[PDB]
Design a protein around this nucleic acid. Sequence first.
RNA 1: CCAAAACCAGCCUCUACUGAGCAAGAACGAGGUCAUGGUUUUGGCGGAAAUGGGGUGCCCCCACCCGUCUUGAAACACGGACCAAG
RNA 2: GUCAAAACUUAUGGGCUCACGAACAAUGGAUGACGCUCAAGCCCAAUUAGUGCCCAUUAUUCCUUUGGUAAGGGCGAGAAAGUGU
RNA 3: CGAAUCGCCACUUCUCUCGGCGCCAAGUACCUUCAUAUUCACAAGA
Lengths: 177, 149, 202, 132, 113
Amino acid sequence: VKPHLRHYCVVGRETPSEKNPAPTVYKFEVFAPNFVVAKSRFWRMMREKNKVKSTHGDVLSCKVVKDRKLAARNYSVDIAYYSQRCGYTHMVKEFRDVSKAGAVSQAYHDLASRHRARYHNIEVLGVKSIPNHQVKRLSISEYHASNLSFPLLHRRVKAPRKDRVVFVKKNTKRAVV
Amino acid sequence: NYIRAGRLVRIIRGPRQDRVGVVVDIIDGNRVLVENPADKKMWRHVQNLKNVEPLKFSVELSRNCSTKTLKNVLAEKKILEKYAATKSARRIAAKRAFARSTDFERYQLRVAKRSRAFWTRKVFDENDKKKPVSWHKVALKKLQKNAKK
Amino acid sequence: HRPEIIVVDLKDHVLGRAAAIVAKQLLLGKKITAVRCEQLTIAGTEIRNKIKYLQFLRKRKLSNPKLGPFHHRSPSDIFLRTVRSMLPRYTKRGQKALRQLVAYEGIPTNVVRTGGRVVIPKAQRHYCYRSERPYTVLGNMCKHVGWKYSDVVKKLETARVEKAARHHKKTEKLRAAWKSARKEALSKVSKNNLEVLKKFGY
Amino acid sequence: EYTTLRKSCKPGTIAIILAGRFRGRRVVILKQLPRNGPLVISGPMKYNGVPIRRIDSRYIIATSTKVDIKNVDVSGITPDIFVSDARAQLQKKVDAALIEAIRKDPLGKEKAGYLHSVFTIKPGDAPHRMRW
Amino acid sequence: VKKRTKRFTRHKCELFPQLSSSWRKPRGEDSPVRRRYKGQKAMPNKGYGSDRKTKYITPSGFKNFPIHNVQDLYMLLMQNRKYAGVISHTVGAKSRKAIVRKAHELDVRLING
RNA sequence: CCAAAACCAGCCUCUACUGAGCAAGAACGAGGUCAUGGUUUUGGCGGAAAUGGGGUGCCCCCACCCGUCUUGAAACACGGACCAAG
RNA sequence: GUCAAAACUUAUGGGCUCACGAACAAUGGAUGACGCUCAAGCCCAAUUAGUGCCCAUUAUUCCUUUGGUAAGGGCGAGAAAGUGU
RNA sequence: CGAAUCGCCACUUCUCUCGGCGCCAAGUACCUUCAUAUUCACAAGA
Ligand SMILES: [Mg+2]
Ligand SMILES: [Mg+2]
Ligand SMILES: [Mg+2]
């Protein structure tokens, strides 16, 4: 399916004051289902880092970021996450995908299973595309070879839904349902 | 037959049902980038491998190959024009003609599927002379008992 | 006269998926006739499933086992119990549907040579099991659990097969005729029809 | 005149009878009656044995196939008309016109045979997946 | 077209021969019926009131009006399409002969003529 | 009286921006429907028919014996065989 | 998945898992039962797919009732100055 | 005794990993019966 997580870049600042007349603007890449969550995660880091809070700031740009292309490539996602079982595991897993958004959402499902880690426990720390060689991880390294061929072994080929059937004659594909 | 870049998968169950398209580049083990200049709707996209059925055809090609390179190379083989030639392809366009068909074409078929099923018997009845059939073979031997009486 | 029965061939189907799909069709009024219930598979090693069954067999009324749960050991009786557990077995709607199912070990001579045998693709073993995971063929576990006819059925299954195969080449001259007769039917007077047959793939 | 009779049902179109005495009979739609009234399909009875008679548009399946029967004069089909000589005479005058209108068409030999056809929902058959 | 055609019977009238079928509102905390559990009998309420312009109207379409003697028939002379005289049960077959051949002459309806 | 179709109304369903995307707007067309309103039409039925009620059975489904004191009753808590009169 | 309405076992989604697994020591027996194991389990995400569905005494809407010490209008058979029929 | 049911077959009706036909002329030639059974209504027919 298309990626779970859209790629937002939320930009914002603490709102101007005589206390801080010309406040720093903050860019912040997020991978969120939708902007309202990206805007939220953005204000999470604003208070967890800048001590500025949602009441006192103002997002200047919620906009989603355009995909680099569509060619299959290779992503080093850097993903801190939390648990009672582990309170802050920095962890640069690599994923092979067509987009930063896809590598990242792929990193959430991966991270949610190997670690019972919800979206809001996780925080992406960056998602570089990587060249073939830099990927130390051995799993996706199997897919680098320009000459890689593999079988689609032991397929379950379900019929197109329009054609699916409950009962069929045994060495035939006459329907009987 | 192995899936690799240049393999000519047949999309199965998606919005682009019957359509084929070359495997431009593997992503990981459960996805690929399908492509095919010959159809309008086979612009490069991420098919899942569950969704594709590899075909016996496969142009030689290099991963992440550009599309204009492909509208080239497959043209120099006509892997597509060659593919439609196969009964495996015709069967797909055949069912895709019956489903696409109007009611009078289905008359116009039944008249043939009887015109032929009728001559299947006419050929057979003529050939009924040569055994076997329950009606003729059973009877020729069946008389064997009658001649003995 | 025969009713609109459909004789599901249960070989290499998952027990509980086939039992679930069949149990539904019986409610929708289908009069199914399961066969080769000996050949139903179950996930896991036979030891996993013998122990599951022997924990079943372990359950009886102390007061009077005679009226207790009954532990049928026929793969077919096991499939009927599996399929009655999946339908309203106390309302008459379901007590009825359960009697519309006829399980058999093997495929009995009344049910053979009666018509084509259906299959349940959603309950196929290859469709369900991960292929390299171990699986329990049902009549095989239940041989170890008390079914006494596991070899009676195999002797029967051997006979219908050797018999069905003898009839498959008793008729090879016949099927070969219609293949030849039908191919030369295209060459016959069906001219414009030959183009309406080319379209549509005939 | 007024007519909401749908675009799929037009005069001279072939049309399956879904209900009534003549189920499954392909039948040319000769005309719609003067008000948004029931169609007057006709067999022709020369083929499938369907008399000139009325049918509601809801009870036929207007096939895409038709015949350019603008040439035929179905004017004698009027509501006031609705076996006596005056009527037996009417269809004879019409079916012969309607039947030749079928002849003029290329592929007019099938449509004669196509109207001898009888529709039937055979088992495994899926009209909803059908187009017509 | 009535809301409810069934009687609202007393709870458990069916078990106790003495109990009349006639409704009594259930009481007792634990009454299944007043606690209005779904499988139980219903209780009457304002919501079962019949539609108010079809109310009191007998299937004949007339509202019944009691009648006792021939003079009552003229109480229905001018509204004979609205009211239908139902002669009282205890008027004699004697007098009913008189009410009836007069309820005929006047075009007034009678439920039991 | 039972039906069916139609009509009208109602009702419902089914560009813009951005860098291919949206946080984005309608249109055309068509469908559904009277347990919506008004307009009949057309057929079917007509000693019986028809709608309604009543009775008995079944089917599917729902459904813990009531009164009681009690925080809590289906309670392994009390009172409760039947009916009549009181 | 069946029981059970709904994924006629949907996904053209990701991982994980072989033995169990699915909010608040003794009558035989309980993920509710069956059964499930490329799950019918778990984490995650989804909704026809890189181009959803089912079930409320709930909501909305319609009809009816009742109440309002609610708001108005009015005064072929009816038109009563009226709390209440 | 009026019924509900509505594809058949020795081309499926073996095994182990597009079955044939039928659908209105016994055939692709429309010869040719069908009405008033009067526009749905259990197919009034198997
Ligand atoms: Mg106490
Ligand atoms: Mg269900
Ligand atoms: Mg009948």
